[PDB]
């Protein structure tokens, strides 16, 4: 109900924003308990 | 699937959409409603 009340630029603002900060989270999940132990993943730029 | 239209009603997802198409909050939605339906007793509608 909040995001609805937005215009056409702040909306592209948000979903922007949104996406850098899931990718923050989703990486450090995947490190510590998704990804392999056999891949010696340690950072995310040992996930790149 | 009903969609409550009235002023204050915290409905469901299906009303959050109509505010985002038609950038207005729920006091300006349940007014279109009355420019659109002077027939309709109360705020619900039909999905048609």
């Given at each position: ?22 990718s ?5 999940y995947?490190?510590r ?16 | ?48």
């Amino acid at each position: 109900v909040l995001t609805a009340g937005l215009n056409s630029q702040q909306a592209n603002t948000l979903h922007a924003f949104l996406d850098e900060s899931r990718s923050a989270a989703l990486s450090t999940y995947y490190i510590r308990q998704v990804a392999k132990a056999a891949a010696a993943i340690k950072s995310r730029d040992d996930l790149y | 699937e009903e969609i409550d239209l009235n002023s204050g009603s915290t409905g469901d997802w299906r009303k959050t959409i109509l505010k985002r198409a038609f950038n207005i909050d729920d006091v300006s939605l349940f007014r279109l409603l009355k420019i659109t339906d002077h027939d309709n007793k109360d705020g619900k509608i039909k999905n048609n």
